[PDB]
Symmetry: C5
Subunit: 346 residues, 5 copies
């Protein structure tokens, strides 16, 4: 019962002629590689960049007859990771990496165990910054689907095939929550077989269904956008005398409404389509621009009105200042219903 | 008495058949690894990212019978760190690293000494950026508990076990203070034994109880939020004549109160729950929005009031402008008591 | 039928005297290297820096007679990438890299296959941050032409020549869209043969015609710039009595128009020439500065006007306040036509 | 007279049995290592992070009898830096590195020369980002003392000792100035002998006395803070009639004074103690808050004043508006004297 | 006619005893190294950091008799760059690197050719971030002189000397323009021979004369600073009645003039000396502060004026409001002439 590495000497070195430069079952059927990932860290979901950082354990399993062994008694030899640069390993890469890296802290974070019948279990900790093109049409109420797809790079489909094992292909750490999102529990697992001018390459991808939390965007942008609408209404309970007051009120509540429009996109890409948060800030910018025009009508109607005529327009001009107090606060409401219900069924 | 490395030649090389690729006490009980950390640098506690950077010395101790020696006279051979790539070392990693690194400046910052009975003392300087999910419910008065946990990655529980030595498992440099926090002196030391679809892996974690200093947030956000509330009150000692003054006063003190609401979260994650600093900026935004409505009542009540009737509402409208001077400054106070006492016992 | 690497032993090692340090067809005609790129990731088109990040697959093809083989039966031996540090490879570099890198995640992302007649197919995943000097004359309506050029660095033109293969020299991933641009489908392919004091070096470049999307810049800068122009007009339907109102209106709508001028260049280089977005913000800053002067004329003309004289200037001063309501809203329009048509045919 | 490296062959290789893995004078007295640094680049003194970047040449000198030589005629053999991975070198590290690095541009920036009697001169270019906890009590007038300390990491005090040579232990490049500071010329040199649970380790540190330049902070924060105080005074030469003017004046000069308070700390850590720049912005925020209350008294006193009574308070209310014009401008001055003299002797 | 590397075998390996660890002409005169650089990328001229990034080709030439060859027929053997780790190479470094790096994309970007008489031509692509202390006295009209200097680090002056070849020591790529600067065509080439406590080291530096483009700073800071001065003048064509208007006008045009003062230094170091852009923003801040005081005089002079007396000061107070309309607009102009002419001859 010699030590395992010396047993591994019989397994790896020039004895038996193991070559790590040639895939298993060479010249025969392709190599069936079953995969699955464990997720430690999920988050930093960027939107200026439209990517996100994950921290996974990538488990790979394939059979290699050359790694058979019956001398040793037990069923598994979880070796040292230094034995990992000498056996064959599939050239798995992430088709949307945007930068990734291993982890070498106190050891290469690597695992490797071999079953008697040649089954290999290979597992390494990885940090990825995967690209997912965000779809920001209905932005605060959107549901993103950021993917990650595992391709081969040098082996064609007839010489290396990936799969997902049918027992929980994607696990997640227990207490894993996101600050801005929630990660839905059903995770898709479909095929993405690529085709180039070089050949066809195996591919498999996992679809994570993110979904934004409404709390933050409800506190910083919607409510402050809404109070500024109400102050635009207090220009109606003021007489048609305070020219500086109402105009000063409206202008101050139309420029601050312009700042928050731009402020609602500081942390966003410069996309060219209008998004759900945009029509809110637009329509809220339309009401406030109306009250500054409503007083524009009053101050002009009253100034234009012999003595039986001037009061004749005071009633009309003052009729407006009472219609305004109900028109705006209710027209805004019915709009406020068609908006949220539009994004409660979309 | 040959030189130690040549003595180490007898200890390491092909003589005696030392293999660094196989753990001590192989096929027997697992390897008991006692740990403890020394902390040089603690800080850069991020909250947008919810991590923090530490600079530790990681000390590991385990027994290895193969490293026994009785030839040399003294009790310890603190070797060169180049002898560190040839002996066995536990594959300790940090389960929430988020990026780490060694230090190679003028030497690998590594220590290694071996006692006669085989005890190994292994110590290396590390920089870590550990992830700790912040809980920002009561934000300026919160108490975070950021952890660090030491797991194995390739050895299962029956073949490698970590522990904390029971003599000061976590030391700290003497004059170590944080700018924003204070690091409490009692540090937890519990177990975090993991379970995967691969097996069970040893784990141990240290719980550091951070606690925010109230000084900064008391100077930039609470007091400026409070002066703006008081200026909202000076719209009461002004007659019910200065329409531009009081409305200009209230509007200017309701928008600047909106900026500071958003300004109170520039360096924060976009969490979806309301936090303690939020109800302050909200309630302070409610008082100021009230004074702008209080004058909305006065200017409307006085404008609506034969000659025995107009003065009848001047008293009512002026009754308000005196009730306001005591109502707001005292209602705000009683709120100001239920707030701080709520976060002095929570 | 020995294994291929051992077949490759006959192909690479000291047998047959293959030297990777000497180009093919040595002392004869130069080495004809046909190229083409596949683009996975395109974007992060910076403008403060005037660069952009691409993620390509660089395919290279050249003949090497030394790599001939007739022993093996089939037509191609797609080897392991470890066989890539032993064969000759052209020293292709990117003449405007500004930083690049390979991808080592789970494998060097490399491909290598050899045809029987010696044809080499070499393909590697690369991330580039290529420099392209932006031309921002007509900025929101511009069309950039960012290049990428493949030069030799050590081999002169008579010893190594690059080319583009005449079957789709530049492919693109199917669903590849940009957030801010659209990538036109015709891609140029011309020569860029360099000359130094060392000699002449082969060079080939690809010209990508980017083109900005107008949606974002139409929403954040043009419309907000335009509403502020209209509020500058509401200072005309107000009587020549509200000195605080109209002046407060104009000043508030002339400073906020100054902020947006500077705000229209936060994410731009500090170029010294005037650009298309600049004349908009300038002319819009000229109208608003006019209305604040138009009231400057009214308040001065009315204040200067025995009793038959004061009304004589009221008509003139009030004649202005009606000419203004049509002059500005129509002069702005005709300008608004010469502007967009100027950038619809330029 | 064979070539020196072949002479060095007799000096380094298996001939003579030189081992680089064992310190000089082994088993005897410790190794006396005299040090000194030359500073090329000093600066980037961060305060959000409380560190700073230096670029030094670290010179080390120790004796090694094994490196004796009398064959060669001259006194010094400045070798190639490749000979630096074969001789012993002290494991000097920087106890507050916070990240450092060598320089490999066109060569490892390393020097190495050996005197006949065994004296070694070892010198390498380094970039450091050293941590120094700032003390920001009297911030714009402060004097920081950022240190750098050279410790051993694996050798205890009885086996390796550092020192500073007594001929200019710290030189500086000639034209080395800082943008924000000035580096005082006397530099401290004391001992910092550490103690751990492992043993006692040699340590030496250099104390650089930085001192801020007052020019910048005098131009951006003090003067603008002071003009805004004066405009708060121009609310006194205005009659007690312009309710919108004085209140608009005071409010506009009390909120802009709040912005600059927060603006005076954008580039600062979130420390919890009040600092010298804070009491300035506070007291300046107290004067401006007073003038807005001073008019609060006037408009209330005049509004409260049969016909012999109303003028009786006009004199009192107008008595205030003249006392204000001298009270504030002189009370501010005497404060302005106790402030600067307080930070001219502290 | 064996292959060149095998010819190079006779040139490099143990045959002939070539040692790369010993400089040419050893024990004799020093090694004369002629240099010159080609500049691809110039720019990213930082000012917060006072550095800049360049992308050069560094060509070095020296003679090495050991590399003589007469066997081969032609005049030059441009080898593979792998032959670059075996020949001697001067240890050139950049005395103000602040971080640099090679380029390894698809090959080490290296060139190496050897003439028959031993002349070596060595050329490598480099990216540098060189430090140049900016002199910002007359900031928008300044002319910086950022240097780059090539020193030895281990060889003293009597054993290695650098030079510039007298045929175009510094070339530049053809279409190389900067966004903010223009690179003057005459480039200095002088000596910078260093002296340390170790010895004297060869040094040579190149002086690039940068010069700012005035376009950007003329558009964002001077003109907006100037319009705000003119609006400060429109407080003069308004009667001495509009207390809220003129004071509101002046205050709004004195605070926005304070923001732009600070805004004129966001991207600048915190230098302690006053700079040319500072006196502009200061003097422009002095005019606007004057108009707010000019009305302070009017409203006080008119309010202080039996019936023959009140009109007596109306003329004096109104005499001011006409002197102002010519005093300020012309005093500002004459200042505006002494300013630009002062920076047209400095
Ligand atoms: C990797 O897995 C794939 C599919 O999971 C295997 O492909 C299939 O392999 C079988 C060999 O057992 C091939 O033989 C076929 O058998 C069926 C009866 O089961 C017979 O009716 C067919 O005529 C054929 O002979 C089968 O063609 C093949 N199918 C495909 C789509 O590839 C593959 O063999 C596995 N390879 C390894 C190395 O494990
Ligand atoms: C590492 O440490 C663990 C615990 O600190 C050791 O586990 C224990 O090891 C003993 C061997 O001395 C095992 O024997 C047990 O002894 C008790 C009497 O002390 C006896 O009553 C039991 O029936 C049993 O024979 C013990 O089972 C084991 N317990 C556990 C929970 O593991 C371990 O031996 C140490 N290994 C090394 C290599 O130091
Ligand atoms: C690489 O490709 C270039 C061009 O694609 C080849 O250049 C040409 O190579 C031919 C050899 O077949 C040279 O011979 C010429 O042939 C024509 C008839 O086709 C004859 O009229 C000429 O007098 C001459 O003999 C030709 O000069 C040469 N032209 C150029 C511009 O280089 C090159 O041979 C290819 N090299 C390899 C290694 O594939
Ligand atoms: C490194 O430097 C230290 C101090 O600079 C040296 O320590 C001293 O070394 C001397 C050996 O010459 C030791 O001997 C002492 O000599 C005095 C007379 O000078 C005698 O009165 C004492 O009784 C003792 O014998 C001395 O104890 C020792 N002192 C200390 C504090 O270490 C050291 O020898 C130097 N080592 C090397 C390798 O250069
Ligand atoms: C590297 O270049 C330097 C200068 O470019 C050379 O320095 C000079 O080298 C000459 C050898 O030819 C030395 O000899 C001198 O010759 C003059 C006549 O030309 C004679 O009048 C002097 O008395 C002396 O013998 C000369 O001293 C020396 N000068 C200096 C300042 O170094 C150097 O030789 C070159 N080295 C190599 C290896 O190319």
């Amino acid at each position: 019962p010699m030590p395992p590495s010396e047993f591994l000497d019989k397994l790896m070195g020039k004895v038996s002629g193991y070559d790590a430069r040639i895939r298993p079952n060479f010249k025969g059927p392709p190599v069936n590689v079953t995969c699955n990932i464990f997720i430690n860290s999920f988050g930093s979901i960027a939107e200026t960049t439209m990517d996100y950082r994950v921290n996974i354990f990538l488990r790979q399993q394939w059979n290699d007859p050359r790694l058979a062994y019956s001398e040793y008694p037990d069923d598994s030899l979880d070796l040292d990771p230094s034995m990992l640069d000498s056996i064959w390993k599939p050239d798995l890469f992430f088709a949307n990496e945007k930068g990734a890296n291993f982890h070498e802290v106190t050891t290469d974070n690597k695992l490797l165990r071999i079953s008697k019948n040649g089954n290999v279990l290979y597992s390494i900790r990885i940090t990825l910054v995967l690209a997912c093109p965000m779809d920001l049409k209905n932005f605060p109420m959107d549901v993103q689907t950021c993917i990650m797809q595992l391709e081969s790079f040098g082996y064609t489909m007839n010489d290396l095939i990936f799969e997902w094992d049918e027992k929980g292909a994607v696990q997640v750490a227990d207490g894993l929550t996101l600050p801005q999102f929630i990660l839905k529990e059903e995770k898709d697992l479909r095929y993405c077989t690529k085709h180039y001018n070089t050949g066809k390459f195996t591919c498999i991808e996992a679809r994570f269904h993110l979904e934004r939390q409404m709390g933050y965007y409800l506190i910083q942008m919607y409510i402050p956008s809404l109070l500024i609408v109400i102050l635009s209404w207090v220009s109606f309970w003021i007489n048609m005398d305070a020219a500086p007051a109402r105009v000063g009120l409206g202008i101050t509540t139309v420029l601050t409404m312009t700042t928050q429009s731009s402020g609602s996109r500081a942390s966003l890409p410069k996309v060219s389509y209008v998004k759900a948060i945009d029509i809110w800030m637009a329509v809220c910018l339309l009401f406030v621009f109306s009250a500054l025009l409503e007083y524009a009508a009053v101050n002009f109607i009253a100034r234009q009105h012999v003595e039986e005529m001037r009061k004749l327009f005071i009633s009309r001009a003052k009729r407006i200042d009472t219609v305004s107090r109900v028109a705006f606060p209710l027209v805004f409401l019915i709009f406020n219903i068609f908006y949220w219900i539009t994004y409660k069924i979309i």
